[PDB]
Design a protein around this nucleic acid. Sequence first.
DNA 1: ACTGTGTTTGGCGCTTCTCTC
DNA 2: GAGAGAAGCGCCAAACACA
DNA 3: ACTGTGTTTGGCGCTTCTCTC
DNA 4: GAGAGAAGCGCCAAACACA
Lengths: 278, 258, 278, 258, 296, 296
Amino acid sequence: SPAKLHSFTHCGQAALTLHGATTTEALNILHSCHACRKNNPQHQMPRGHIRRGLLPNHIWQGDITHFKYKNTLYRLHVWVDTFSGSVSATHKKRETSSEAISSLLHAIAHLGRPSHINTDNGPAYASQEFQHACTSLAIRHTTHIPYNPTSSGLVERTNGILKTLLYKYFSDNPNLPMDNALSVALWTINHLNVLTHCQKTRWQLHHSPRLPPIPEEKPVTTSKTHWYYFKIPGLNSRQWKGPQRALQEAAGAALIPVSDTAAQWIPWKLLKRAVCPR
Amino acid sequence: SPAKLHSFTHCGQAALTLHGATTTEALNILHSCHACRIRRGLLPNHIWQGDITHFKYKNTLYRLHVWVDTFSGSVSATHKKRETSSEAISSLLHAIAHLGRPSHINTDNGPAYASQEFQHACTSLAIRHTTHIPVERTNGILKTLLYKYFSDNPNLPMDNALSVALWTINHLNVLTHCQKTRWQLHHSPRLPPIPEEKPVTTSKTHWYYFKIPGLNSRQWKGPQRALQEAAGAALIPVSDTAAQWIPWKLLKRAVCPR
Amino acid sequence: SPAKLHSFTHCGQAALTLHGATTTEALNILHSCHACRKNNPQHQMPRGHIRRGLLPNHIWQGDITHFKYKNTLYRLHVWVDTFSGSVSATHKKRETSSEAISSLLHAIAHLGRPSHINTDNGPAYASQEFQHACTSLAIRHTTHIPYNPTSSGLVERTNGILKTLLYKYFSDNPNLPMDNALSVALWTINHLNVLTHCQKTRWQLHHSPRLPPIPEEKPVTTSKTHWYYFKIPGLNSRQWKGPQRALQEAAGAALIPVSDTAAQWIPWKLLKRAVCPR
Amino acid sequence: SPAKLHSFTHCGQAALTLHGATTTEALNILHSCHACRIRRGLLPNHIWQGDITHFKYKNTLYRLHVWVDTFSGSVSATHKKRETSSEAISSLLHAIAHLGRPSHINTDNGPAYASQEFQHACTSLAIRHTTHIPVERTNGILKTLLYKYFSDNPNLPMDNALSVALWTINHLNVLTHCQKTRWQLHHSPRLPPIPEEKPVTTSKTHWYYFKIPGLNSRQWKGPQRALQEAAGAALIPVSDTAAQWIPWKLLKRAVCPR
Amino acid sequence: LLHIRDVPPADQEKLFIQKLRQCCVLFDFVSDPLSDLKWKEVKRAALSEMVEYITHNRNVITEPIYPEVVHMFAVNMFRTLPPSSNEPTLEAAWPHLQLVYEFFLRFLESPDFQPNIAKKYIDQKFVLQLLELFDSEDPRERDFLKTTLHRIYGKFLGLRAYIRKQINNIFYRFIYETEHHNGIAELLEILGSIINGFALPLKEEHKIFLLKVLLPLHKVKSLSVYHPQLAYCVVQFLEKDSTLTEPVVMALLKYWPKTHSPKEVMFLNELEEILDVIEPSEFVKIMEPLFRQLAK
Amino acid sequence: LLHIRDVPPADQEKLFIQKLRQCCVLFDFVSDPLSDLKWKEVKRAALSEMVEYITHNRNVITEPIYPEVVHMFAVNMFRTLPPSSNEPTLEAAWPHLQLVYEFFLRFLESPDFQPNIAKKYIDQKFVLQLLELFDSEDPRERDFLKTTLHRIYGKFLGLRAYIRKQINNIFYRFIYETEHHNGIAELLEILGSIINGFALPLKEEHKIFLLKVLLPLHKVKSLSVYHPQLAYCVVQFLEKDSTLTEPVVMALLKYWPKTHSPKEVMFLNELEEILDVIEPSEFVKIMEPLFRQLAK
DNA sequence: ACTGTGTTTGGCGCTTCTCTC
DNA sequence: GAGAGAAGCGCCAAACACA
DNA sequence: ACTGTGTTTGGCGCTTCTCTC
DNA sequence: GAGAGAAGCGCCAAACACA
Ligand SMILES: CN(C)C(=O)CCc1cnc2c(c1)c(N)c(C(=O)NCc1ccc(F)cc1F)c(=O)n2O
Ligand SMILES: CN(C)C(=O)CCc1cnc2c(c1)c(N)c(C(=O)NCc1ccc(F)cc1F)c(=O)n2O
Ligand SMILES: [Mg+2]
Ligand SMILES: [Mg+2]
Ligand SMILES: [Mg+2]
Ligand SMILES: [Zn+2]
Ligand SMILES: [Zn+2]
Ligand SMILES: [Zn+2]
Ligand SMILES: [Zn+2]
């Protein structure tokens, strides 16, 4: 019998077929095995994409990176516009809620006032002071899933780009001051470099006529939920967990009960489809 | 709300009119506040004016390097605690980053702007530099706005105040002659040239094969025309009733069906 | 001038084109900049592939992996045939040259005597005892580039496969003995599972008639050498080094002088093309 | 070289003849060494015979669990220091891993092979088990080969000796009746069935688009027929003068041109 | 009524025409501050959905739409100008005006626009009535008018020489007959955009245009309010041909005011740029008269 | 000569034919241990390159090659058998014999082999001369002969009933006329492979083949040397049809030797497998006679 | 001599089959 | 009677982890 | 609301141009 | 005189790293 053979050896599809079974029965046996699905790291689910603004100064992404220069650890606060790609960056000595507020104000002066900003769960971003500052100018601030840097991917990418230019600027002349390098790099990024796919400059997109208005959006989501094996983003696990049933499914993530007490938001890339128990 | 906006930025009534406030309540809010009651350049980034100004405080002084465009009035200001050719170079580079590269630069004689460092810095960017001995008004607006901000709250670190003042001057206040802000006047694209004996045809954008996000599909369904192109995504009509912003990774270049 | 503008700002191709330059001149300026090539991690060179036997028992790959089971750290010595994919594995308590010799002898008893074996530069593989054992049976043993596990990729892959089955076998019954699990897993891998692409079993390939003889090979290699930026495999470096000129180029690697004293073998994937100085 | 091979394995002269040695010098080497001077099953892996044997040493004893195929004579031996149903199960599983799953199993009564553990283990694999009260020759060959190995060198760990003895018995010695080794007899594929009133057509293999390794190409040049298929690579004629083993990642499935 | 996006496409064009026609009704803010509040609100809404819809769908504009939109623009814009009153006052009807300007701008540059259909629905009368509207006092009005006239001139081919002649006529009228005008700077921008695209050799008509209306424009007492733009236009001629600069410098030197005035620096500024381009090509023919005039 | 792989393909076939023909010369190892050493070495080499080349190129075998290869095999193999001498002795010409068997095996199963070309170059005479060669004493000879005859029977269609009749004739001769044979086990393997592919219903000719030659083969004094394989063949008939097992068990019971002999256990062994398949289908018709015969 | 690889998985194109107007 | 849903089956690129 | 992304790089298909029988 | 090498130019998937 294929079922007992697979229960003993956990052989594959063709092994069950050669011992006598149709492709459908063998594939069903494979899909119904909890052991063969909790221990296989392979899975197949759709990809997620960060939310993008519909016009300039709609949604911004901000992050803090480090830079080593002449035995000095500079903290670079970077803000990027999710529509035009325009970048504002300031260099400081440490990281703090007050410095995040100062960088936000400088970015607003350089680019304009945004409607929403989304950042990771950094120590200086969930502080009460930052929330008060955002509410002062009526800026809605949300946070990503903790321990999931891909959700801030755009700004992360920008960080690398910025740092690369700095290295070039320090390869020719190691005695160049940090402020000069940062200003020249910002000028090059925003005014001189041309975006790869739209074949335009970030500054040109930022200040292009706003004549196209906003297309209307729909908050309609799927009303059905599924079962999922899951992995917690904070700590890497070798094998899947569950399966559990999603309380509610969003675009790019799902609400999964990790314990019997409270649930958690899990991105699509740490989830695996599960067969319905009933 | 207009009241909070003025309480935080202290901009003019015509600035509030661009927001939800109407002229009558704009004037009411303007007079309800205790603290409130020629162009030589031909194009933006053609001729700049550079000044160094002393900002007075109760127990300290600041040195503000200010660059003003002679066509739009756009202002780039940077505060320092000393005055040297190096800081002049840094301020010029910061102004270039914020505004753009100027073709002609004008300033006064002094310890800065006259040493070989500043001259070499100008020649590296290929900026023609002329110096003369005798704008001073935008400096006054900057001073009075900073003073109002500090009077409202004495606990400010002098960088947030400068940033908010620059935002108010460049993005909030509107010019009297043309009812525009300095930012819009500076960054308004110019009219393209019109060739003679040759019609100006409308540019035709590109066609894309697309995939709908969140479906894990593997077949590009239909080539469509792009409405708008931005960084990170393009506007494609998924149906004849709605349009969606599809990311670049889900787009593939196509050819016109002909 | 595009040259001075790029020397100051290190802007991209389109920035130089919009300031007046042909595509050829701008691209040449980009390719001739040492700063823009020492600091860009992107590069474009061919891939390498492990050497494969031409018939069963021609070339083998061996490795040692760890397994945690009931507070016991078992050492799995794994040998895999590069032609048929057949696997022999033995479990031990520690790692030593003598245990490597014992595992080799058990693998020879299970599969046959190989001609060559290639393993990484493990402590128990470069020992004099292992070389003496290999010479005793007239087995040529070579070693890979140090700190480059991809060169042993096949056996590494096999390790993972093996461990996965063990986990399944321990998911159903945690009280199953280690030797039983290993024997059942070896039986499943070599006799029951079917290879993905050739649609056959490892045992069937191992014992298939040797009627097809060996195609003749050619040791002819390219007689020209190039310049390369390089990165040392042992330690990760942010920026490239060099460029230097290759003393001799092999299939998949090159001989590069790291210092003025001695050279080193560098795989293709840690090299970047360089323009000829003359 | 034949001398080293016999000095290490002590196999028969007919084993040396399969190597470079000819019969006359094979006999010379055979007599130059001081230490050397019916089938019940119908197919391989049909009926096995299982014995437990005491291997005597100067200061210790070993218990060898031996499984012998009744058709080919292939031997699977495992050494232990005790005797129980668990070790019988382990030895049976090891023999299955080395040789394959047997359909029918035969052994003697004893403390092992009779408890519910062994019966359950046999039923899990669906192996029919019969036990009887009275091969013992292959046990003798194993004993004498082990004794020769230990006499040659007293410093052996008893696992290397067993492995070398199994290699010599299964892969080196050749059977007298058919001039084959036990390994070849056990693992020789059987003749496929011949259907009646239906010709046995030759199987047609597949076509592949390929890329030459070490070129960083991006265009699949030509669909070719595969000569031989193995794990990790396939044999493709790159030209009309030579063939090469191309890895799977550089191969793409094609369709016959027709 | 019914939203245009929530109807089958078979009768969607008819609903678009109806929604075009329902906005043809006028609404006067200057008559009284409060009149037909809900009518004005629904008109503003409809303009909003129209401008949203026109810029998100293709193959929506066909033949029975082109003349009707022109009629709508003519009804909403072409009217008697407000009485002259010499910060400038703001038109009280700015919501509808701005929304309809946005709609017209988005309609004129749609990729589905065809230049073979507007040649019979837009004629010289429409463009004359549009050019007459530049005399408005609201600066935003003039900004939208400039950016509309630029597209109008760029798109059409048979209406180029006519507009050049008309701009010469209006310049003559402004400099000789009537001294009341405030759209001079936007017109100078349009002229600069047009003249940046000339080809060689320059025809004698452009030489007449330079020698007749552009240099004497320096004599206007209100020069300062449009001083920079004017200079720009001059710079764009002497770049195309450095030989034809002699009449320009001769007119600038001969008609230079001999009396002291604060606006003289204006001329000096212009001269600088001229000098910055006149040094090459060995231009010393009028260097001595220029120095003699500058000395005084 | 010249290697086949180092020539243009235009004349490569001619060189292949020449290299085929140059190996037609015989070499007798039994005549004397040393004769034509370099001729033998070059023949062995050429056989090696031929077997290497045939299995690495496609579209290389065409019409003018098929009969010549058959002639080469007939010249190298078909000959008078060595004199009977009752471990078995090994043929001294084993190098060339093994290499040419390898070549023939690789040639017979090439994908370019066409079954419409060998029907006129290989006939009954060739297959009879091949089947006559099974009486060799070298076991490797018989192994290659078995694996060659399997392919020969599988590939051809018009030579199946003829070979069945010939195998019946040789079985009759072995069991009645001549008692000297040693290729019985390989032939039984061929029969098992052939009979595993029967279809239903079984024709009466196969029933005759069972009732005439297979059961009486149990009477041979040399049964043991081919005991297992024979049993296998029997097992493959009663599986196809469980109704026709009555004559088989009747013949096994009636012709069971009534005298004690060590080989009797052989029969017992066979009986077990028969029993292991005969319990279903309510087969108790001959259970009592079987028990009565087993009791004695 | 030096050099990454094999398995898992949902989504599709394909072929064959069953229940309904 | 017959073409439209449904079941069956082989194939594939992207993810994945091997200290 | 929750969600990866933008730049670099050699190899090609393409178009246009120059030196040689 | 004219078709065959050579130069020019836009495009693309695979690598890469952002703590
Ligand atoms: C040179 N000296 C002095 C030493 O001590 C060497 C110690 C030593 C010996 N063996 C090793 C390793 C280290 C080792 N780090 C790995 C290993 O990283 N695997 C993960 C892995 C990553 C990427 C990949 F593409 C494939 C992979 F498998 C490994 O597999 N093996 O075998
Ligand atoms: C939740 N709590 C309590 C905390 O303290 C949070 C501390 C904190 C805050 N910010 C962070 C990080 C951590 C962080 N590990 C990364 C980071 O790994 N980047 C590399 C990276 C990897 C993959 C990728 F696809 C893209 C990438 F950029 C990062 O980018 N940012 O911003
Ligand atoms: Mg980050
Ligand atoms: Mg290792
Ligand atoms: Mg490893
Ligand atoms: Zn399973
Ligand atoms: Zn106030
Ligand atoms: Zn560079
Ligand atoms: Zn010996």
